[PDB]
Structures are given as C-alpha cells and as structure tokens.
Amino acid sequence: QLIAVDEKLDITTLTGVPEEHIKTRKVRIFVPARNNMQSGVNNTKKWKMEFDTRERWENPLMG
Amino acid sequence: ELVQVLRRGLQQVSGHGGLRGYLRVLFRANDVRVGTLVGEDKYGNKYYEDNKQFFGRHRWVIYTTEMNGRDTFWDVDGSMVPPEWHRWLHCMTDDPPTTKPPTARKYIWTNHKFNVSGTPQQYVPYSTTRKKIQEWVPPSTPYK
Amino acid sequence: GTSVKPIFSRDMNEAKRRVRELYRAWYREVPNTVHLFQLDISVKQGRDKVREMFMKNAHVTDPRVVDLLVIKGKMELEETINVWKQRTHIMRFFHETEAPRPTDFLSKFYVGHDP
Amino acid sequence: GVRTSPTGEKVTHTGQAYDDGDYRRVRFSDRQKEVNENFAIDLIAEQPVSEVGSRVISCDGGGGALGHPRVYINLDKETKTGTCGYCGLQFRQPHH
Amino acid sequence: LHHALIPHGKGGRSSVSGIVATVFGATGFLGRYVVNHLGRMGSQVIVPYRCEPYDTMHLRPMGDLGQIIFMEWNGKDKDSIRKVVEHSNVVINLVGREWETKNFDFEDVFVKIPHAIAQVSKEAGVEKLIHISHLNADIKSPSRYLRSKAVGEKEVRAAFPEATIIKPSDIFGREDRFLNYFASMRLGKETVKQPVYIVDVSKGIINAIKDPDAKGKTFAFVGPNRYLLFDLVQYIFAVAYRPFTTRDKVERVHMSDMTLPHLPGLEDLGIQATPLELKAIEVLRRHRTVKPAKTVN
C-alpha cells in the first residue's frame, strides 16, 4: 500500500515552468536586512527566497 | 382636443422665426420645441430650458454653426459645450453661469476646445523626463 | 524508507506500461487530428512532435510524477479528440512565430545580458 | 516662460526636448507636441512677498479646507524669506 | 550609435531593436509581411500611405504602442518623401504597380519614384536603402515592365551607391497574384518558372537589413526548384481539385526566369528556401469545395 520509493523529490516537470527559467535562474535564500532608516526589527523574522535580477529597459513610448 | 394641439403646433412653427427657422431647427436638432432662452455662448451656442418637460428634456442646447476652425452646421458633438454651460446642462447645478459666473483665474483657458482626436492638433504622448545616463565624449585631439 | 501513497502505479513497470499506452493512443490519433483541424503540418512531423514531447520527460525516475504526467497527457488527448481545442492550441506546440534562439556563447554575448 | 529648442521643439516646464539626432521626433510629424503654456515656477515667482509682524506665520494655501495642510513658517532669518513647502508663497518680517 | 537606437530586450513585441524603417508601399502583398517581420522584433516602423486609412487597418496590430506611425505621401512631391524618411535609418522601397493607370505608367512607378526616394534618402543621411527589382530585369527586354525596372535599378544605384538591390523571382504566397491568378482560370512546355515564398523574401529583407556586409551588394531571391509552366499549372489545379494584366502580364508570365549564379542568393543570408509543394495546399485551400510536379535543374 506504500511504494517506499527512495529518491530525491523533483517536481520540476509538473509545474509548467519553461526550461530556461529553471536551469538558468539563481535564487537567493536570505533573511532581509533591517532598513537602516528605521529601528524596528519586525521585518527580519522570516526567510525570503528571491530570484536574480534580469534586464530592465526603457519603453520607447512614454519612457 | 385636436384644435388645441394643432394650434400649439402652429405656434411652434411661428416661434422659430418662420418656415426657414422651423426647417433649420428640425433638420439640425430633430426637435422643434420652443423654450425660454436661458443663455448665449461666446462661441455661438444657445441654451434653452422648459421646466414643464420631464427631467432630462427640461434643458437643451442649440449648437453653433461654426466653432474654432470647423463648419458645424451638421457635425456637432457634446464636447463643444464650455465647462460652465457643461455644468448647468448636465444638471449638476440649478444655476446657469449667467446668474452666477465661475471664479476667474489667470490660467483658465479663455478658448474652449472640442475633442481634437483625428486632427493634426491631436495629443501625442512622450516621456517628459531627461536622459538618465550621459555618455563619455572622446577628445578631439590625437593621442599619438 | 520514505513510504508514499500511490496514485496509479506501484512501481516503474506499471508506469512504463501506462506511458506506452498513452504513446499508442497519441500516435494513433495524430493523423485524424491533422486532417480534422486542417493543419499545414504532415502526419510524420506531428508524430515527431509527439515523440519529442514524450522525450522531454525521459529523465523521470518517480512513478508518481510519471503517472501524473500520464494523466495530464490523457487530458490533453481528451481535449484534442473532442475538438475542444482550436487550431491555435494545436499549433502552439510548434512555435512557428518565435525567432530561433542561439545557444552559442558569442551570439548570447552579442545580443544582450541574458546568460 | 515657454522657450523653443534649437531644433524648433518647444521646451517643456521640466526642460524636456528631443535632441537633433533623436529619432523619436518622428512621432510629432504631421501632428503636434503637447506643452503647457503656463509655467508654475514663473507664476509663483511673480507673487509678492507678504509682510507680517510675527516670528511665526501659519499658511494653509488659502480656502481653509480646500488648501494644503496647515504649516508654520519661521521668520527669524533676516537674510532671506520664509517659503511655504506646499504653496510656494513667501513671507517676511518688516525689516527696518 | 545614438543610445536611443541601442537594442534592448529579448527581441519581442515590446523590445527595442534599433531599427527605424520607412517601408514605402507597405499596403501591398509584400509590405504587410515586411512590416509584420519588422514589428515582431520591436522595430519602429513608418508607413507612408496614399490610399484610404481604412485599407491600412491590418497593419495596426502588427506592433506595440507607438511603434507604427502612419503618414500620408505622394510619389510626385519630394517634401512628403523628405518628411517621411527624415528620422529613419532604414528605407525599404516596395512601391510597384503591375498595370498602368491614367496617372502613373511604369516610368513614374519604377524609375522616377525609386530615384527620388533614393536621392532624398541619400541627402537625409539614411544609412541603408533596400530597393526591390525583378529577377528578369534587363535593358533589352521586350516588356516595358522589365526595362523600366532595370532603368530604375541603375538610377537607384547611381543615386544611392550603398543601396541593396534585391531581385525576387515571382513571389508566391497567400495573397499572391501567381497561385491565385493561375487558379482563377476556371501555351506551355517552353516556359520555366522559379517561384519563391513570400515569407522567405520577408526574412531575406530583414536579414539584409541586419547584414553589415551586404551594403552595396545585389541579391536574387529564387526558389529551390525550377518548374516548367505546364507542369506547374497542372499542380495548381490538382491541389485545388479543379479539372484542367491586359498584354504586359501575359508576356511576362510567358517569359522564362533567368539564371544568375554570379549573384548571391537567399542561402548567403542564412535562409533555406522552402518548396512550393508544402505551401501550395495552404494558399489554394480556399479554392477547393500528393504527386508533386516534376522539376528541371
């Protein structure tokens, strides 16, 4: 009633992400630093995972 | 009865300045009603009211035949009404701009404009900011 | 250990059996799909596209992921058989209007900052 | 003060004008460029400086609840005037 | 390179490719494909139109917001051509009429207009000019079309020495006048044709725009297979399931396509020409209600 299969979990084929947004992106796992403009620490309690910055350009119309 | 309504129709014909005015108003506005003149506009529009008509038909405007640059005997639109008569006509207020006029400012347009889409004076958007990064300019002198 | 609840298949053998069944059905359906939607592709290249889609997931070594893929492919087949899709949905597999992307390092260096 | 760029384009109140080599000027061909003729900086420079006999003066932009939030301006620096951070109006003590 | 003209993005609808193009005659059969291929990668396109703007509607969804600008022009005024190509670094000349009108003969359309366009572009500082001629264009042709095309090509080369002359060979496509004209019938065995795909010609024009070394060169866009006219016509009826332009066009279509191995072709632009057999069904499916024709090489 249980397979008891022993393998590293990988659902990368079931989420529908394009292939070049999986093997090319580099995620950062970190606790965000406290904003030095303020003395509060409530924004440094959890962990954040984010993606690497890619190119941003200027729209020819309206800039 | 019938006689009274035909007499009222005859008075409607008479009150538009004769047969020529009757035909002009009938072919320009598809309406031949007569009401008390409330206001005259600096562009030529005329504004009439009739409080015995039901709400929405108690106020109307006969548009001018010539706005800023175009003939307007046939091609009329609602964007021609100046803002004060726009307020009075849409029943946002009970007072025409004649009894009490709007406050006068030095930046308010003295010349209203209609919708200028489809015309050379239409609006074209652009980015109103300056260039963020400036490039290096090489010297004009030779290096060797 | 890592005991897990099965979806459809107990091990990889039943998973491969289901994969073969699905491939059989898709290969059989291809020419009828080509004729019915009046596609400009041939039956040969449609079956090649089916083979390529099946090959895209060839590295999976998990029965649960495999039969989830089989279920999704079966739903896609049900969509394409009942003509719930249109020609656009079928032709979306071929990326005809996309510019070819060069994997060469020099080409990628010249075009922009994308690695 | 509406000015005109050497290429002919009107310079906006933000100082924006496409340079001579800019292709984007093609968008204004057979059409016009929208520029506001009233430059607020000049209009606020044309206002007189009001003299008040107090060290601190309050400004709400005029109109009460129809202006900006009420702020208090100090007038102890005799070298320059006190300017409202919202409206731009200038205030001064009666020097001499 | 004028920073605003630096490519940015991933070559998509909302990207910048640094190409400002003035496509004369963009309302025709090849103009729509050229404008589509230009706008797919985000280039700014200027469309000069003489017709009613209703006929230019189909070009509006071909680009992002503000990337396609329509301006009016006429072929006999130099100021219109001036204001249309003033800010463009690429000019494409697709102006051409298959017949004569009371206001334009072949002289006006194929000689005077291309020469004026090339001269105005050269004066204005346009970097690239792409002029379209015919494969069979020579001075000693019996047809006025080809003589005018050849004289216009020489005049364009004189006025704009760095122009790229592209000589397609009887373009066929969905809105073409070759497959449709032959299928609209409802002499042979001596005429041979070299039809070329419309998308192939569009890709060739775009690649020539992007090609740095193809500045003053001359290309010839031809199909892979040479077809005799009779055999080719038979295939058209067969695909369409049908049982088997005053004087100039019949003479032109009875002429055989030349062969210029000295001229570079579509391969040198990295394009593999597609056979007519594949796209014949696509074009001629609308004419309805498998044994490809034999070729000679």
Add this chain to the structure above:
Amino acid sequence: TRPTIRPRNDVVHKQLSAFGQYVAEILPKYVQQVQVSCFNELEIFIHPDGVIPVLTFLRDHTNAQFKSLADLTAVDVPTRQNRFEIVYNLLSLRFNSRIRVKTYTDELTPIESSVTVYKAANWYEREIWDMFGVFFANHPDLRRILTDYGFEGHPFRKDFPLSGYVELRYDDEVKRVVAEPVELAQEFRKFDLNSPWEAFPAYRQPPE
C-alpha cells in the same frame, strides 16, 4: 468595549465548543484538532484519509446533518511539507449552523474525491485541480475548468508569476492567434508595504 468594537456572543462560542468536543469524541480515528475562533467559527483539522467518513457523518448524523456544501477551496503555503490545505465549508439548515473541515496534502499525494457525499463538490474539485494541481482520486471527470486549453502550470500556486509565462496576440503571417513569451511594456511595480514595529502583540511568536 464602546460602540466601535464588534459585540461578542459567548453562548454560540460555548455551543460550538461543545459540538466540537462531541465530533472529536465520535471520530477519534481522523480528527487531529478542533478550534473555535473569537468570532464563533468552528473548524476541525483532520487526517487526509478521513475525508469521506467525517464528511459523511457531518452529512448524515441526526445531530449534525450538515446537508449543504457551501464552498470547497485550497490554500497554498510553500513553507510547509504538506504544501496545500483543503478547506470544506458546510452549512446545516436544521440547526442554523456552519462548520469547517481542514485537510492537508502535497503535490504528489491524491485526496479522495468527495462527489459521492456532495455532488456540489464536483466542479469545486476540478477548480482545485486547475489551480493547485491537487489530484482527486475517483473523480467522475477531472479536467481543467477555468484556464485555457493547453495551459501549462497551476496559476494559484504561490510560486506562479502574476502575469504568467506566455501571452497571446494575432499574427498575420500565420493568420492566427499565437502565444509568445511574455514581455511587459511597463513591469509590475512591487511595493514593500510591510512595516516594522509589530501591530498585534497577541500573535507574537516565540523567538526559538
């Protein structure tokens, strides 16, 4: 507690607590936790294997007979090992009451479909499969219900981008509607709104 504060009803709180203890006693094989909120809402967190039994009890027991399925949805919490939580909201007209049942699952573990207990569940389950990828075993026909045909991915997952991966337009060269990688004329502006200086001391977590 002056007029700006919501009034409290302790009678309903006591009734819901009593019924929660009652349900927990009757079905200890599946119930893992019972909670009542400060606004008198009763929720029961159960083991995934007890979807069909517990629901049936709540549908059929004389003292519960929760005969209406108001809603069935899922919540995505990536930080948990069991990523998805399934929520059943039930209404009983005889007792004028409402109950909530919670279950957990992950990507590769199928929940047993509850169409037999409630037919109304059917479409709801499809939606979950369309939005979170939760497979429901023994569903009469499990397929996408809201997304486009051929759409890849599940959009209501927390790791799905807001604007998706592809966008549609019309291409004249191929004379049809095509899908291309998504590019935005203006990128969505991400705002950092969360402020320091915690607001509610009652929810402060231990510093571990």
Add this chain to the structure above:
Amino acid sequence: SRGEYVVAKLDDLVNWARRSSLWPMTFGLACCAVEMMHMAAPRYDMDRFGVVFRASPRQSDVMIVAGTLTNKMAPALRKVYDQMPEPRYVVSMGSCANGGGYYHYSYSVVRGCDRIVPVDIYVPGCPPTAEALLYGILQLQRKIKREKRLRIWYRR
C-alpha cells in the same frame, strides 16, 4: 472638372448611407455590456440613430468589444471578426478592452483587444456611461463621414 465632382458626390452619398445605418453586433463579455444595454434602453434609444439592436454577425457593420478579452476567448473573437463583411469597424469599450484595465497584469487576460483586431474608436471608462458609448458611436459616424474612397480610386 465634372469627373471628380461625380465621384465626390457619390462618396458623400455612400458615406451618408453607410454611417446612417450602423448595425452592431456586441460582444457582451463583461459589465460593459450592461452599459451597452442601457444605451439601448428607452432613455438613449440607439435605434433612433439607425443603430439597430443585436444584429447578426453576417450582417453587422461594427463590432463592439465590451468586456475583458481573456486568452481562452481571443480565438473566438478573432474568428467572429473575420466572419464579418466589409466595410467593418471595431469599437473598444472600457478599460478592460482598451488595455486590460484592472486585470492588465494577469496570466489569462489579453492586454487590449487591439492585439487581436484593429480598433477604430476607443471608449474610455470603467464602465463608460451610456452617453459615453453613444458619443463614441457618433464619433465613429463622423470618422466614416470623413473617409473618401471613390476619390482615392479616381486619383490613383
């Protein structure tokens, strides 16, 4: 000369005929359809302008896109537009149809109906009032009146 006078008067007659009877088929996708039905209501009475109510796709002059166009719906709208005879015009009503509007940054919404079909008139608002849509229809009528086809044919 008389040759251009004849085509000018023929243009005037044909333009008057085309703009004086506009038969719209409306894509009632979302809430802007409600304002369309209010423009068809007794107060505004689109029919009094010659603009009939709910024409058939095979006999419609103008297409009114009133609502959000989703990715699942774009092929159907394009097919219906292609089935329409010429001359044909498209009016984009509301923010959702103009540029996506409130759902612009969505995975299942087409960012503007002009990615699919060319648009003649853009009616702004969320939703535009019935008076606003009537103003857009009259502006389309003026645009039709401005056009000139026999003249273009004659001078070409």
Add this chain to the structure above:
Amino acid sequence: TYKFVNMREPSMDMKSVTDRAAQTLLWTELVRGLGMTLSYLFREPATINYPFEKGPLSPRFRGEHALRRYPSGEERCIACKLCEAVCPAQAITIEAEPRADGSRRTTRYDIDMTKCIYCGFCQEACPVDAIVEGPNFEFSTETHEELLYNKEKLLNNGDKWEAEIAANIQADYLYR
C-alpha cells in the same frame, strides 16, 4: 414569515370551468396583454435628444482626470506619491526632483487611461487636492496612444476644466 406564491386551487364548479374554457377558446388574457401594450403605446417616451440633451449628473461624478493648481498659478502636486501608492490598477507613474527654486515638484506624471478603473481613490488620497477626476466623460479617442496621458495633458485638462472642477469641489467638499 413566509409566503406561498403558487398554492391556489381552481374551483371545479360549472361556472368556473366554463370561464376557463372561454379563456382558452377566446384568448382573453392575450387581448389583455395586447391592451396593456396598446396603452403603453399612447404615452410619452422616455428618450432624451442627445447630444442636444444630456443625462443628469452630480458633483461626485468621476470622469476624466486633471491636475489642479493654486490661485497663484502654482501646481498643487508635491510628488508625495500617495495617489500612485493607492492606485488599484497601477495606472499612475511619478518621477520627481527638486525644482530650480528648490520646490518639490514632479518631472513625470503619467496616467494610463486604458489601465485606470475610475474608482476615484487617487483624488481622495491626495492631501492637497492636486489630482482630481473631473466631470468630462466625452473623451473617446481613435488611437490607443492618445489615452496614455502625461503631465502636460493632465495640466492642460486642469487649465481647461478648472471652473467646473472648482465648482463641483465647492459643492461637494463638505461631505468629505
């Protein structure tokens, strides 16, 4: 308390059966509907004569946007970016910098009218009454690009509609 809508029982005596048969064979209720439609024909229609007549509006009506200025002629906007932060549709884009005289003014202020949902949140988040939603609603356009407003267009709108906008604000500011 509940009501029964369809819980009536027809009487089975001869007179009522004859009445029902007469209704069936003579179509009485059909003539009743005909008569009601006929009566509706002989009353005044509710149609107004647009564009010469306009529908009623109110000072609170939200139409086209505008940027206002102080009576001295100085723009009210101080680049606080509250309207941009509150905008549900992300339709407002603002860039600012110190002016030549050190004033806090915007250098870029765009509103995408094809993104705007016309909720009026921007004009109620503004603390200086700079951005308002005017009463103009007849601003349909033939191209998409002209619905992408910038600072010049909005300032022109304010200068164009200031009289009516100020009158509406005077009429309705005591309810805010």
